[PDB]
Amino acid sequence: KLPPGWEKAMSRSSGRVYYFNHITNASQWERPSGEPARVRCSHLLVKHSQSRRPSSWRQEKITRTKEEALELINGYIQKIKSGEEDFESLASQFSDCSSAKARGDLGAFSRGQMQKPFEDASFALRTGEMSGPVFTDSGIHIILRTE
Ligand SMILES: CN1CCN(c2ccccc2CO)CC1
Ligand SMILES: CN1CCN(c2ccccc2CO)CC1
């Protein structure tokens, strides 16, 4: 029916059908368009107090809750989708990953290298697609597949 991970859903507030991907947590009004040895991704990570290492170049001690991290992620996603902000700009400024210095770029990778939820979302994204919030032991990720 639909590409890997996609399902139809019903908007509570509008009643319009939309599409949701349960691997990437992407959601969109438009019917989804649709695996390689490698993908290239950028990401914006927001850590929280239960992250594997609650510390980053932005904050020596990361004290925000997972719920607070998710709200930050949601707000970055809204600004990226509205065009108010670019993914690369937000990642450079606010990602708790050191890859912030590279506009969030992680370079290219294969299956078996990244944390599994990150890997699964990365490989379910089409080139140029962005995920919704993806949870790993590092925190909450916005993933952009660039290659
Ligand atoms: C020593 N720390 C900074 C340099 N490290 C790095 C930088 C760029 C590419 C890959 C790596 C390591 O996988 C992260 C750890
Ligand atoms: C686990 N990852 C190691 C390599 N990462 C990094 C850091 C700085 C510049 C570029 C990169 C990678 O493109 C950090 C996270």
UniProtKB/Swiss-Prot annotation:
The modification Phosphoserine is found at residues 55, 92. Phosphorylation at Ser-55 by DAPK1 results in inhibition of its catalytic activity, nuclear localization, and its ability to induce centrosome amplification, chromosome instability and cell transformation. Ser-55 is dephosphorylated upon IL33-stimulation of dendritic cells. It comes from the Eukaryota. Expressed in immune cells in the lung (at protein level). The phosphorylated form at Ser-55 is expressed in normal breast tissue cells but not in breast cancer cells. Peptidyl-prolyl cis/trans isomerase (PPIase) that binds to and isomerizes specific phosphorylated Ser/Thr-Pro (pSer/Thr-Pro) motifs. By inducing conformational changes in a subset of phosphorylated proteins, acts as a molecular switch in multiple cellular processes. Displays a preference for acidic residues located N-terminally to the proline bond to be isomerized. Regulates mitosis presumably by interacting with NIMA and attenuating its mitosis-promoting activity. Down-regulates kinase activity of BTK. Interacts with STIL. Interacts with KIF20B. Interacts with NEK6. Interacts (via WW domain) with PRKX. Interacts with BTK. Interacts (via PpiC domain) with DAPK1. Interacts with the phosphorylated form of RAF1. Interacts (via WW domain) with ATCAY; upon NGF stimulation. Interacts with PML (isoform PML-4). Interacts with BCL6. Interacts with FBXW7, disrupting FBXW7 dimerization and promoting FBXW7 autoubiquitination and degradation. Directly interacts with RBBP8/CtIP; this interaction depends upon RBBP8 phosphorylation. This is Peptidyl-prolyl cis-trans isomerase NIMA-interacting 1. The gene is PIN1.
